[PDB]
Amino acid sequence: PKVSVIMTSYNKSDYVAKSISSILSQTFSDFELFIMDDNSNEETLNVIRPFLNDNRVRFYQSDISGVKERTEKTRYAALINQAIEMAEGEYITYATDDNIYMPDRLLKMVRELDTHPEKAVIYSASKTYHLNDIVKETVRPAAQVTWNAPCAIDHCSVMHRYSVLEKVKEKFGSYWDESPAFYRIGDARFFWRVNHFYPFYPLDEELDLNYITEFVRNLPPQRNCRELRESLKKLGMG
Numbered sequence: 367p368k369v370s371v372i373m374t375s376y377n378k379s380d381y382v383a384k385s386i387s388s389i390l391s392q393t394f395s396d397f398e399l400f401i402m403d404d405n406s407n408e409e410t411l412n413v414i415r416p417f418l419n420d421n422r423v424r425f426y427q428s429d430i431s432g433v434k435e436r437t438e439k440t441r442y443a444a445l446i447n448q449a450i451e452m453a454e455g456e457y458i459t460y461a462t463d464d465n466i467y468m469p470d471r472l473l474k475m476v477r478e479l480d481t482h483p484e485k486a487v488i489y490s491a492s493k494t495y496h497l498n499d500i501v502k503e504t505v506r507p508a509a510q511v512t513w514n515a516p517c518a519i520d521h522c523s524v525m526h527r528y529s530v531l532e533k534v535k536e537k538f539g540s541y542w543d544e545s546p547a548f549y550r551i552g553d554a555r556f557f558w559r560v561n562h563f564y565p566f567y568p569l570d571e572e573l574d575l576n577y578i579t580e581f582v583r584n585l586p587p588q589r590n591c592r593e594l595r596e597s598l599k600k601l602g603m604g
């Protein structure tokens with residue numbers, strides 16, 4: 367396949383079907399979709415089940431259970447790294463069980479990396495609708511090239527060449543950071559790794575959407591956005 371879409375799922379039965387459907391109806395169809403489920407409850411597995419009949423779906427379910435195992439690592443980062451090791455796409459992109467891709471997202475992102483060989487990482491704008499009908503719309507823009515993506519660009523708004531992954535693992539030992547101190551902002555921590563080597567190039571269109579309408583006590587103190595943004599300003603790549 368040209369694209370590997372990596373989706374993480376854990377217990378969001380009321381949202382996961384719209385997410386999976388938004389990927390399977392993309393106008394660019396040459397992808398494989400990893401559905402990495404972290405041993406979710408039955409209601410969520412029942413929602414996912416019919417979509418496993420789509421031949422592009424690569425479904426993997428962990429055997430994780432209990433607060434020790436759930437807090438040993440940032441679990442979605444461990445599941446993304448597992449899917450990366452199995453990925454066959456030239457371009458890698460990420461999805462979640464409560465985020466929706468707009469229909470032309472893959473086509474537009476694939477075209478921008480095919481047209482510009484000098485760009486290795488691209489990102490689009492993203493929109494969030496708050497409901498209570500809509501009471502508020504939030505947009506994270508994509509207006510400039512940035513060497514400081516942490517907390518500015520979401521998990522679900524990027525696409526990058528597979529070759530980016532090699533530089534990150536050579537420096538850091540893994541792709542995503544499985545430390546549980548980066549559970550709240552694991553996306554920002556992976557983008558911080560990538561920004562040691564590559565800037566993120568903008569595609570100024572809103573291509574992904576979100577709607578908003580004993581575990582926590584066993585994680586360690588969470589590292590925050592300011593930490594990551596200041597370390598990249600000091601690093602001075604841009």
Ligand SMILES: [Mg+2]
Pocket residue numbers: 367368456
């Ligand atoms: Mg190929």
Ligand SMILES: [Mg+2]
Pocket residue numbers: 521550551553
């Ligand atoms: Mg987040």
